[PDB]
């Protein structure tokens, strides 16, 4: 009976600890995934804007090429 009593309270501790552990890990996973997704969305936006800048350089390059002819 005493061994059983010890087992019950260690079980209660273990399940509480495991709850905390899994909550902790779920949250770290979610936060890392969110961080990476948001950063990727910004990176893509900037990438498109930078392609506009390049395009604009070509337009002016094109105008300069046309000009002397």
């Amino acid at each position: 009976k005493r061994e059983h009593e010890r087992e019950v309270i260690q079980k209660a501790i273990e399940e509480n600890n495991n709850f905390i552990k899994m909550a902790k890990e779920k949250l770290a996973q979610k936060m890392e995934s969110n961080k990476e997704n948001r950063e990727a969305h910004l990176a893509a936006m900037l990438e498109r804007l930078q392609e506009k800048d390049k395009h604009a350089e070509e337009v002016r390059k094109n105008k300069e090429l046309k000009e002397e002819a």
């Binding site: 009593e5 087992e7 260690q10 399940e15």
Partner: protein, 430 residues
């Protein structure tokens, strides 16, 4: 000098425990300060059964007060008889047990139980010749039920050859709306079947119904309920406390009352039934005492004794009366209703008479029955248990404390086995 050590646990346990000490202190002529002021030598002759002697000829209850929250014990320490208790014998926590057997038995109670056992040990060591223990508690809450049965098991381990006696208050939906009480009670009965020698089944269902039906109290209080309990506890301990022939110690009582070790759950009864301050002016006659003490309406367990058979009976008469008339009337009950007494235990009804009446009465009588009808009580608890357990309802409160469902299944099976064993001897012929 055969000492009994008294333990009271949880709210109910301490409430009825404190009332027990008020009632028997007055009977023994001990005042709230522990000073004796009585007029009869009969009062002191076996005073050492329940009291230690101090210097100044102070008498101190051999009582240990236990709870997982301070409220009720603060109440007691501020009550009338608060000072009478040994201050170091107050053992309490702060967390409470939240009406949860698992908290009392496995988690919260486990943190406190060694402290209690330390006090128990100090009291036992002081004993010339310890008889055993008596515990007051309810089965429906968390501390008295869970920690109370934890204590019973630990005390049995340290004192395996001593008698363990309990006054156990059974829950009823007539008195409590807490949904988990049938769980707490079933888990506790499982413990009691294995580890006590004698258990007085004090049923809140019966207590409430006596107050409402018989005493005509439209709004019964715990005070009213406990008035019945303390009258009963006084009556059933009379043979332990005063000079006498029959059932004069815990072991002799058990040998007279318990023919099979698991069947040690007693139905108490009392007459006359009174409310607090009813203060009645006519004494009952011996025939009246005898008729009423055996009546269903006077039982403290809500079981119809006519639905079962008596294995054994103890009857205690108190007051100045004709012992001849007592004998005649007791014989009349048995000879008039002989079919309700098992025929394979000859002469199974024993009678004691004590000259000192309880306070406020000239005449009273107390009944202790080992009846197979007590199965009705366990059946009632079992039905309430199964209604929830079949859907595993409210179990998360228990599994959160580390318990497994298997433990519930085992407790239920053991109580249903107990029920079946009563039925077996009910139907048994010589």
């Amino acid at each position: 000098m055969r000492e009994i050590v008294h333990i009271q646990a949880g709210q109910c346990g301490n409430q009825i425990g404190a009332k027990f000490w008020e009632v028997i202190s007055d009977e023994h002529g001990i005042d709230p300060t522990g000073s004796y002021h009585g007029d009869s030598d009969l009062q002191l002759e076996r005073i050492n059964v329940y009291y230690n002697e101090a210097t100044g000829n102070k008498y101190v209850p051999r009582a240990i007060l236990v709870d997982l929250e301070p409220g009720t014990m603060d109440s007691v320490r501020s009550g009338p008889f608060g000072q009478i208790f040994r201050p170091d014998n107050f053992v309490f926590g702060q967390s409470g047990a939240g009406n949860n057997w698992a908290k009392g038995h496995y988690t919260e109670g486990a943190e406190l139980v060694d402290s209690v056992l330390d006090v128990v040990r100090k009291e036992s060591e002081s004993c010339d010749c310890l008889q055993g223990f008596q515990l007051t508690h309810s089965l429906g809450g968390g501390t008295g039920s869970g920690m109370g049965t934890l204590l019973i098991s630990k005390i049995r381990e340290e004192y395996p050859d001593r008698i363990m006696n309990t006054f156990s208050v059974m829950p009823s939906p007539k008195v409590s709306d807490t949904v988990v009480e049938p769980y707490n009670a079933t888990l506790s009965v499982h413990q009691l079947v294995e580890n006590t020698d004698e258990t007085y089944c004090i049923d809140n269902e019966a207590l409430y119904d006596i107050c409402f039906r018989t005493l005509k109290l439209t709004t019964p209080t715990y005070g009213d309920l406990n008035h019945l309990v303390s009258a009963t506890m006084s009556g059933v301990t009379t043979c332990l406390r005063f000079p006498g022939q029959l059932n004069a110690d815990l072991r002799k009582l058990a040998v007279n009352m318990v023919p099979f070790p698991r069947l040690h759950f007693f139905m108490p009864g009392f007459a006359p039934l009174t409310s607090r301050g009813s203060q009645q002016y006519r004494a009952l006659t011996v025939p009246e005492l005898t008729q009423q003490m055996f009546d269903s309406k006077n039982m403290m367990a809500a079981c119809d004794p006519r639905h079962g058979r008596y294995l054994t009976v103890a009857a205690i008469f108190r007051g100045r009366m004709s012992m001849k008339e007592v004998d005649e009337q007791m014989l009349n009950v048995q000879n008039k209703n002989s079919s309700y007494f098992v025929e394979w235990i000859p002469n199974n009804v024993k009678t004691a008479v004590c000259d000192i009446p309880p306070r406020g009465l000239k005449m009273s009588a107390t009944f202790i029955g080992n009846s197979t009808a007590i199965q009705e009580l366990f059946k009632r608890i079992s039905e309430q248990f199964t209604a929830m357990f079949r859907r595993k309802a409210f179990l998360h409160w228990y599994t959160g404390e580390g318990m497994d469902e298997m433990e519930f299944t085992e407790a239920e099976s053991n109580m249903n086995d107990l029920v079946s064993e009563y039925q077996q001897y009910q139907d048994a012929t010589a």
